[model samples]
Target: SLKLPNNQVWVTRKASEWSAKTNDAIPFKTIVEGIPEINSETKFYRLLIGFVAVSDGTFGMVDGPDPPVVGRLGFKKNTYRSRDFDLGGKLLNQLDDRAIVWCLDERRRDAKRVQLAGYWIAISKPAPLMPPEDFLVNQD
Candidate 1:
């Protein structure tokens, strides 16, 4: 499971523990070297099933015990939202003993970017006050 608001920490419990919310301390890959090399002001990461260091400690998580539910986006540049991911921390830990801290560059098209600094072991903070139920009706 992704710790949101940024990317650094990750849940290190089992999928059952995660579902049960029994774990407390999540794991985070510490910087193995100097500041992440600058290609842009921000860096990017993509999560799949498990995690593995690509090079220089920079890692990508995928191809393991896939999350049962994964949230997504629409009409946006990005696809997945960190808040949408939910899975077993221990399950992931078993995938790799460590997630070394390193970040590569991010670019897809002619010109695109924002370097993410880091993450959470939990979901986003409480959403601000929402309106009442049946809170909406278009002007028609």
Candidate 2:
């Protein structure tokens, strides 16, 4: 635990390992549930560092209860979708076995690479838990 000033903790998890091969525009699921942190540390509102991968054309999240179908964040420049987990990591808490970070490419995108993997990170300052993560730190 590296101390900074007030209160902050950074934790990361290899959230998914699901990929689509074949050059077809079809989406898939990568379930993320039951972790040592999810419910255990309910007081933390995390600035989630997440990503969605594509081989060539395009890829993005599909608006999920855990992460999507209509969000339409189509790999803007960096191919990563960095969003927070609501106010509490509890957004991730209720996602037990019913959560997935879904992603899909444009038509005929994945050929050689054929992978869509990402990490879920929580950069917490151990706040009051009543404030949303977006409002607390994402003020700029």
Task: Give a tens-digit lDDT track for model 1, residues 52-108.
Answer: 211121222333222122321111233322322333423323433343221323322
Q: How high is the lDDT of residue 76 in model 2?
A: 43
TM agreement with the true structure for every prediction? 0.23, 0.40
lDDT, candidate 2, 41-129, per-residue tens: 44444434455444223333333332334553444433545544443434444433333233443433333233333444443343344
The candidate maximizing TM-score is: 2
Task: Point to the candidate with the largest lDDT.
Answer: 2
**CA deviation > 4 Å runs, candidate 1:** 1-61, 64-75, 78-81, 89-92, 97-114, 122-140
Give the clashing pairs for model 2: 62-68, 62-69, 63-68, 63-69, 64-68
Q: Hey, what RMSD does candidate 1 come out at?
A: 18.7
- Stretches of candidate 2 exceeding 4 Å from the true structure: 1-8, 19-41, 55-72, 76-81, 89-120, 123-140
